[PDB]
């Protein structure tokens, strides 16, 4: 299941970001946010590598 | 009373050697590995 990985990582970045911006100095979870961004980004380049229209739907969903 | 000394004998339970330890400076793992390597091997 791929779109649950992208969507799940998106909610991960939402909850972790609204953690981090009202907190502002945790330099440990910064790596977690950046590993999630990079991991999701290699997924988006993967599904963009496979398809057009379907990845256009992944952009249009979020 | 007799001339027996159990305060020195009991004293080595928690030795006064934690006070000859604490006169000189707080120094890190080189002399804590020397003193605590010789001390981890003195009790074994």
């Amino acid at each position: 299941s791929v779109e649950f990985q992208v969507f799940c990582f998106t909610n991960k970045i939402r909850r972790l970001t609204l953690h981090l911006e009202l907190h502002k100095k945790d330099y440990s979870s910064q790596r977690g946010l950046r590993k999630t961004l990079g991991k999701r980004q290699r997924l988006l380049a993967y599904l963009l590598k496979i398809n057009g229209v379907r990845y256009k739907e992944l952009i249009s969903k979020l | 009373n007799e001339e027996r000394l159990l305060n020195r004998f009991r004293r080595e339970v928690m030795r006064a050697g934690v006070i000859q330890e604490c006169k000189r400076r707080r120094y890190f793992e080189n002399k804590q590995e020397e003193k605590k390597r010789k001390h981890r091997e003195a009790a074994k």
Binding site: - | L5, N7, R8, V18, Q20, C22, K23, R24, R25, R26
Partner: protein, 118 residues
């Protein structure tokens, strides 16, 4: 004089280069103190077991106006002045209830100063 009660605590500040033999009552008003610097000789000689013996003897020889039976001793600190002091009090042989230590055992409070390098 004093309260005239023959029970009372004895504190022995055994330093690394000195000894102090003080004796006081239960509340803490000192009835006498005598150290190694008190009993005459002073310098590198003070703080040796002969100074502990002489300082303890000249300390508690002057409590004969009280004649304390029930003694209890509360020593403190490192040095070569402990065991000769306890042999001095047991030499006077008065009713030594219990000796004890009250030495400051820190829980990493302040930084102790530089190592000597001598």
């Amino acid at each position: 004089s004093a309260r005239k009660i023959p029970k009372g605590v004895i504190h022995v500040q055994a330093s690394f280069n000195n000894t102090i033999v003080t004796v006081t009552d239960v509340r803490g008003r000192v009835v006498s103190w005598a150290s190694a610097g008190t009993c005459g000789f002073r310098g590198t000689k003070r703080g040796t077991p002969f100074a502990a013996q002489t300082a303890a003897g000249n300390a508690i020889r002057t409590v004969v106006e009280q004649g304390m039976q029930r003694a209890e001793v509360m020593i403190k600190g490192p040095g070569l002045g402990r065991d000769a002091a306890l042999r001095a009090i047991r030499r006077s042989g008065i009713l030594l209830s219990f000796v004890r230590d009250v030495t400051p055992m820190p829980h990493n409070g302040c930084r102790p100063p530089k190592k000597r390098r001598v």
